[PDB]
Design a protein around this nucleic acid. Structure first.
Ligand SMILES: [Zn+2]
Ligand SMILES: [Zn+2]
Lengths: 114, 115
DNA sequence: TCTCTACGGTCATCA
DNA sequence: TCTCTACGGTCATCA
């Protein structure tokens, strides 16, 4: 009977992280580690990791969870990604947390100047 | 039988202009009047009239003719539009031939000022 | 917890 | 008679 990979104790996994993101991880351990397991909207991914629509729209590249748009159900569906997947890609894209910090610095100086 | 609308003589219409563009016009008159009947690629429409993909991709807004891409058949299909349709829209978009000329002037001073 | 495309302008590859 | 979207940024809509 397989144990949550963080706590090594629990056997009931979080249904979304298990089912959608293929992570053997319990709900509690997920709350106790947002550095890995927090879900981000598509807008957060663009803003916080400078990903783009081509990347995030790629189903072979990220798992995602769709929900109704909380602003109005007649709006485009919300999409949530799991931080570790995202943050792995961003780092590979930009060269670790350092390289990403630089990109953040770069676009920052861009708009100050504009 | 219905006669061409340019010459009023011929009864055989140009098959593409008739069939695709819904114009009762014959091959000869289409050659004698490119100001209306010449076909333009999608790239020509963008360059010469500052139309955009959303506009040109709209089937309700323009008729179009698709052919194999003459550069390579594995490339995206060529699309051709008829000048009068295009030039009507551009004029409505930019405010006659005058307003379009200005837009042409506008983007050209843009490129100069990008040294 | 929001999202998508529209707008400049353009090189590349199918490219 | 070449076409597409990829990139930087951002606002309006549904929007
Ligand atoms: Zn656990
Ligand atoms: Zn005729």
């Amino acid at each position: 009977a397989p144990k949550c990979i963080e706590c090594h104790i629990n056997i009931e996994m979080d249904p979304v992280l298990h089912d959608v993101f293929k992570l053997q991880v319990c709900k509690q351990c997920s709350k106790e580690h947002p550095e890995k397991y927090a879900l981000l909207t598509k807008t957060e991914c663009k803003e916080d990791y400078f990903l783009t629509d081509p990347e995030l729209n790629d189903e072979d590249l990220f798992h995602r969870l769709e929900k109704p748009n909380p602003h109005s159900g007649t709006f485009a569906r919300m999409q949530l990604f799991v931080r570790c997947e995202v943050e792995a890609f961003a780092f590979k894209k930009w060269g670790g947390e350092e390289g990403l910090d630089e990109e953040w610095q770069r676009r920052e100086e861009g708009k100050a100047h504009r």
